[PDB]
């Protein structure tokens, strides 16, 4: 078949496309530090964009830090994929054909980047080898004196992001093909999520991490031992999604439960509900053993990445490990044998449940009163809180008999106990807040749809025209972590606000968990209120963190299947098409981790803008365009090659918002694309203006820059907007026929084809 | 006493803002050439909104209402415009930015009602890659500003704001 | 053939050996930062060993930072090896047999780690693939919430270090086999090193970096164009060693020159001598273009890792690039084509030499006087100097007409111009110092022996018994970077002091360059004074940075060839043998880079202690044993299995000294090993006591802990030391026969076999 | 005036040492229970060696001569012993270290004649993983110490040392 110009890309292979992107969206640097500390020549003070002892300046150092974050995220996803693929090939075999669903382009990201079309499982190994090679080169570039310019660091960050997307795609494809995951099911079963969904009268296993192989072995033991209804297994983070997707192509509800995000780990440990904690991979707290040994909660590690300093009893007999754990010799162990782990963990939970009865860190009412009365209001806890919660005010209210302030603080808190280590009264602030909100915690239940996987080709053909023309207002990819600024309900509010306006909302990761935790006045979640297909007004959940590759590949497949392009080694052309025509925007309201940065950068390289939470300014790098400059918003017409002006949309590639209202406005405005017809532009403008008036109280100042025709204006308020154009901007509109005769700067051409590349322009 | 408590959990570096009194902040705001009043959503508190409106009216200061604080300025008789705070920080570093009204960049920005970890990250770029001055008149001590108030309680913050208005 | 228990090791495969090492040599943590800044939950204040929002504490964060440094160094060496091997296979072929020299164990590190015995060049690809896989896993471990314990981070750091040694071995083997490098030649030619060795009346090419692939092409063009005697090509850093080793198996002197270390890059640029600068990879300053455009010095990049933000003219015609550079359109370009680069660089130097005549940044005498008179003695430059040089005092002396202070400061300065960016008088302090020392710079010439490569098996048989028994006082591996605390002569002083006492001094990297820069009163360097074989009193230069794998493999071959062990997958046993019997110590007096940390950690895992400079405390982690505790210095006898006490030697695995005198004392003391015979112990004790009296003024306090027999004492001062043992410690010595009858705590057994492992003990 | 100039090129964090006068340092040294005098090779300067000897003799302070400063103490009548500074910092963090003389650990260490980037890295571990107090009486302001002199010239350093000896 035909091949594009960029198969198996390297830093020099994608430098032209990255430079084209950075010409419009300039990299804004927000250094987290005034100093660099990489080598022993330092620490070097770089305040004022000064240079270090090696000659690198502040901008270069910030770019290098962001590049390191992106390659770290890529490494996590790639290592997950490699481990999963090795286990899957060792068990099921490498001749097993790939079964992703009902489609022809099985691997969109893989085909786009490496130009390959894998058929069986063994064909995925060379992709992983190439990813490992490129990761090695990029990590070598981190060394001192290895790059002097920040723009080349940005190019390498883009390359790392697309490598991360390839790795996520490999991992998700392998696990879906092997472990009987749902195969692009519009109607996958609803699963229970929440801390209060766990039945604490039963032995409780709690799985934390991202890798699910050992979890699958534990589930197999529980199923074949008929222990599904006698025990309770819950999961935190993306491993919960993976276990709830396990063997669910039969579409029956799962029995494993979802507890919450990373913010819930310490709260669940302090509650005393878990009987045995098993940790697998990334996103695992480092104080689990210290906080668990107080409440006699054993910890079992199952991966070499997270050994947790525990003894290695992998080759020891299961009963011996159980006896040493019961006697209290060790707080846990490392078990790298999957059969032995799957036997051991349920038995350990069973034999530990009767031993630890009523043990919890939640204070009693008298103890809570004494702890509240102990405080002196010195303000160190408020200073140390990542979310700047007014802890001293809540405690002062608690001294008077009012516990509503701490109850309100409960949802905003991320359960990090950074406040407890600065109190000189030794007040367990996190436990005090949990005690104050113990009723709301008991009421914390919800429903979330299981991870469907990728999007089938039939839905792609159904929605491609609607999306490219703007009939569908756009795609909102609500993804990312749970480092929210003002609680976990903001993602729910945004998702509801955009589902009510018939957007296509695709969710994944911890954000799906937090969306499914809130019900309306009647008592239904968004997942049961709206269907789960890929169409207007539908919220679909792709699955775990590695499922964002399915959203990116959905954009790729919109470009390929509909417009009839070639994916193989064609990153620049497909990304240009996505940037100019597909109205997709991403949202990471609580991104904290390096994987989030890698996913965002990979989406940027593919042409998808992203809004992030206020905490994401600590990533040190955004991509923002200049609207006042006009030379930046100029492309070529693909039919001939002439200069064509485009509206300033998207006006950024990565930005950070402060509140969820401004985030809603930004998401509504950034779905606008060039090459939108009159009806699509009318719909997008209507939604943007309505949201701006609802949340910000004013009609957008630059709304007129997106009007090319009288049909572009909203149909309901056409006359008032025409009068506004007549008066404020002195345009010329013919009132006899209600048409625009003079004023617009970009004329409307239906067959105009805006492109950023001249090589394929004719 | 707005210069007593200047405690921080973490430090950006050796350089830090100068803790100032109400008199010094009042003089700096009154002697500014082309000031801008950057306000976040934290200004929507009723005790802060009237103070911000009075400060802006006393010196005819254009207002950049970042976040979702714009609804609190629509009814008031002030010149306030919405702009994303990250985009505003990016635009302040460009010397040839026309500005909110298109009359040139600004030399001083007054900051009120902002989240510490957000305004600090914007001010990092502002102070490291530009020559704009920043005056934080909030209740949290901001390191990355040029001049800033110290840590204050809400009552003390209100009293300091009244003192600044009195000398304006 | 037989295989050991650990082929292709992972983190869990080497955790027992690392734990055994850390039981004795406890990890000391010296945090460079009170805060962690990895994710957006932070920055987290960790002062007082507090925990961050993820639960990780100060010790864990310091261990993670050191682990990141080690994996970065491993990545650099591995990427160098992969690029070199790919180029070599593409040119010469993958069927080319490996020709390392005259030996049977061609790849000691590779065989020790992966259990493989490669024969041709193609067999090295799977090793590189395994290294890339393990690098991916280790970099994935860097993510937030991926490891909670510091000891597991230390284990992964050891694994990264040995992976780094494998990568260096691969790279050096490939380049020596392909590029006609000297094949273990004890008599490799002497090459000229120094800034003053460059003839500035000729067109000058300056090559900076570590990769020589492109350089070799430039050398081929110069040779076949008969331009060797009309131009001057010099190199800085390890690429200089690589070019001076190119095609030198014929043993004739090279024509390329060595300019200096990383500290000389900016000084050479400011001198104006270079006509064209070509940069390949790591250890390249980031302000080369900014400082070169003032003096019209074009910069040509040749690798994707360092593209320097220059335009990419790889496919453009050579003459067009030359004309654009000459007119001043661009300060340089990126050329990824090796033939084109090899044609372009000499022609560019030829056409640029007549254009830039007399251009330099060195001030004139009147300009220098005015600059000196401008200073007001505010002290910011002294505060900003990494070496804490008393710049204001030197300038105050210069105001009075004395330039000896600045001349003295010239050698201590590392040419980083961090002082220039804080002066409010805009005084070019680095240029002022260079002007003051312009005579000494003109006199800076020296000789260094070319990189011989690995050590042949014949010399290993010759020296194994002497080294193991202690007849040879030991091996001193002087390696590392040029971040010296008090000038570049300390390495020369140490090397001379240890060569005068008949140690085996093996050098590599920038330290060899700095050793060869100093001559005695007569005028000869150490390289011409002492032979270059592998025996007592001989200083041998292995080559570039990737040649430290030859020193490590020399230790592995001492263990294998002599004692008759099996290398294949036998890391723990070989490392235990090296730690207990081989008296080898390393010294990195000016280590700053991450590659230095990786090499040191790899040597530590192999059982080789290392001394570092005072700047190396910024690495955040040392490995120091407790001498007062006695349970730490206990091993098992390999013949039976009983408990055997050993002297506290080595007392550290990684330590930092302050001055070179203390470093000499530490190196002398840490060559002492158990299982030393009476004569070897006598020699080592004599050298240690003599150096301690010479440099510290006292006889060592714990000298008696290393005496097991009256024959262990030095033969010349036996009686006085016996009287000291009789008096100070109240021992019992028979004066009739001059023998020790009572008092020692460890008895001397000739056939005692100390081992740290019970599995192979019988 | 040893508390005026406390400038730094780089900062370890929010926590920093307290700048003290000669009277305060003299009181702290005189009231120490089991002090140790850690001296580097920088003490070998002739004007510093006699001052260090007089300080140690005035209070019978055992001396840890790190680096190669031991030859400057052999002839004098002081109790000085060589120890690697990194190893000394490692041993001070162990509560059950017998000490140089085998009589227990130390609660206060006086630091004189050290490289800033070396003593700071040792003091980082000492202050973060132990309860030992550190008094820097050198001419460079040390951040990681507990109490420290400010930045001083050589003449001012000598005058401050004489002032400390006078009050000892
Ligand atoms: S970059 Fe991060 S680790 Fe390094 S000094 Fe700054 S805050 Fe500390
Ligand atoms: S890498 Fe450069 S800026 Fe960073 S510490 Fe080293 S010399 Fe300074
Ligand atoms: S740190 Fe403790 S004592 Fe101080 S205000 Fe907070 S809860 Fe009260
Ligand atoms: S545990 Fe909650 S309240 Fe305490 S510092 Fe962390 S986020 Fe703030
Ligand atoms: S990784 Fe842990 S310690 Fe570091 S900033 Fe994030 S939460 Fe804080
Ligand atoms: S910074 Fe400049 S003016 Fe100040 S002491 Fe140094 S050379 Fe003199
Ligand atoms: S250039 Fe030399 S004198 Fe100046 S700061 Fe660097 S090392 Fe010190």
Author numbering:
A (entry chain A), C (entry chain B): 40 to 801
B (entry chain C), D (entry chain D): 3 to 170
Q: What's in the article?
A:
Carbon monoxide dehydrogenase (CODH) and acetyl-CoA synthase (ACS) play major roles in the global carbon cycle through the consumption of CO and CO2 gases, production of acetate, and breakdown of acetate for methane generation. By contrast, methanogenic archaea employ four copies of CODH (α2ε2 heterotetramers) and eight copies of ACS (β monomers) that interact stably with eight copies of CFeSP (γδ heterodimers) to form a massive 2.2 MDa complex called the acetyl-CoA decarbonylase/synthase (ACDS) complex. ACDS plays a central role in that process, wherein the A-cluster of ACS cleaves acetyl-CoA into CO and a methyl moiety, the C-cluster of CODH oxidizes CO to CO2, and the corrinoid of CFeSP receives the methyl moiety, which is reduced to methane in downstream methanogenic metabolism. Through plunge freezing of the ACDS complex, we captured multiple subcomplexes including a CODH tetramer, a CODH/ACS pentamer, and a CODH/ACS hexamer and characterized these subcomplexes via cryogenic electron microscopy (cryo-EM).
